[PDB]
Amino acid sequence: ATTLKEAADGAGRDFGFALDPNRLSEAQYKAIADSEFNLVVAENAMKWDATEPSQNSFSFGAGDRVASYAADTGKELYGHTLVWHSQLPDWAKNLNGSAFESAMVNHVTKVADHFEGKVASWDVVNEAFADGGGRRQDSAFQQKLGNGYIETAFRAARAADPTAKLCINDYNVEGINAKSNSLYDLVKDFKARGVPLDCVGFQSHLIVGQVPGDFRQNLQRFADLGVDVRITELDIRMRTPSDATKLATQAADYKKVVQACMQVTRCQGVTVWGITDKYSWVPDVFPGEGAALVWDASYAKKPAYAAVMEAFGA
């Protein structure tokens, strides 16, 4: 293998990236997208704000651009995300009770129908749980609808799309902890009761030098519930600027994560949350942090590139 795509392809796994369709007009970004990945997810274009800016009025141009990109380049298309507390339009926040439930259901139905037969898997529900265990405490869905909204969303998604893989996705659930235990309890419950649910996403927004040592064990216990698992938003952030020590640790960290996936038969693969440090979400959220991706801000391969290649077994 001379690309990450080749390494993943050879391994029988997915290696994906989060796409901003506007950056496709930057030829270097498109060149790397085209050649280094076999899966794509929309970083932002398929979220609720991006798709339903006013009630029952849909804006699918950006999401369609991502889907068309996947079809044109022969990549698997991963759907993110139908139900998420963050960036919810004010019109939806202003609804309550049955009116809010119906807006959620309509959102799930219309977005899943629109992309049916293109999107292979959906993050149906994103970030439902709380660090330290139990349900998230600043969620419009949890607050307005209570515990049952997750099941409602999954059933609505399956009603719309009979065959898509339906995933629940979260962060800080990579190790075995109160948060991933709560997630585990739900997955086991849903499978026990025949609630549509096929996969679990582990975002893996990690800090350099801090990869959970029990990540493989955790992925395995989820797979053993009878669902597929996926590393969905991998990046590994450091204090900037980078230096040789930090880049080496980061490479070792990327290898640890990709190996944990390789070690679990039902781990579908690994998606990194962007291509280049140039565009990464990290610096805007965590001042003085960044350099979290596989390519730097000038599109030079970092040591993480070789590590990922090696981990896929190339």
**Residues in touch with ligand 9MR (CB under 6 A):** 43-44, 47, 86-87, 126, 203, 233, 281
What the block records as the tokens of 3 is 């690309």
- Element containing residue 232 per DSSP (H, E): strand 228-239
By C-beta, is 87 or 137 nearer to ligand 9MR? 87
Q: Could you confirm whether 76 is annotated as catalytic?
A: no
Bond preceding residue 283 cis, omega within 30 of 0:
no
- Element containing residue 40 per DSSP (H, E): strand 39-42
Maximal C-alpha separation, the chain: 55
By C-beta, is 232 or 312 nearer to ligand 9MR? 232
55-57-61 Cα angle (round to 5): 135
Q: Is 270 helix (H, G, I), strand (E, B) or coil?
A: strand
Residue 235 Cβ vs ligand 9MR, minimum distance, rounded to whole Å: 8
Bond preceding residue 240 cis, omega within 30 of 0:
no
By C-beta, is 121 or 309 nearer to ligand 9MR? 121
By C-beta, is 232 or 250 nearer to ligand 9MR? 232
Contact in structure between 37 and 75 (CB atoms under 8 Å): yes
By C-beta, is 210 or 263 nearer to ligand 9MR? 210
Contact in structure between 246 and 291 (CB atoms under 8 Å): yes
State the catalytic residue, choosing from 6, 233, 289, 310: 233
Q: Which residue is nearest to ligand 9MR (CB)?
A: 281
Q: Which of 185, 175, 178 is nearest to 216 (CA)?
A: 175
Residue 226 Cβ vs ligand 9MR, minimum distance, rounded to whole Å: 25
Residue 180 Cβ vs ligand 9MR, minimum distance, rounded to whole Å: 16
Residue 168 Cβ vs ligand 9MR, minimum distance, rounded to whole Å: 13
Residue 2 Cβ vs ligand 9MR, minimum distance, rounded to whole Å: 29
* Amino acid sitting at position 277: D
Query: Which residues are tagged catalytic?
Result: 233
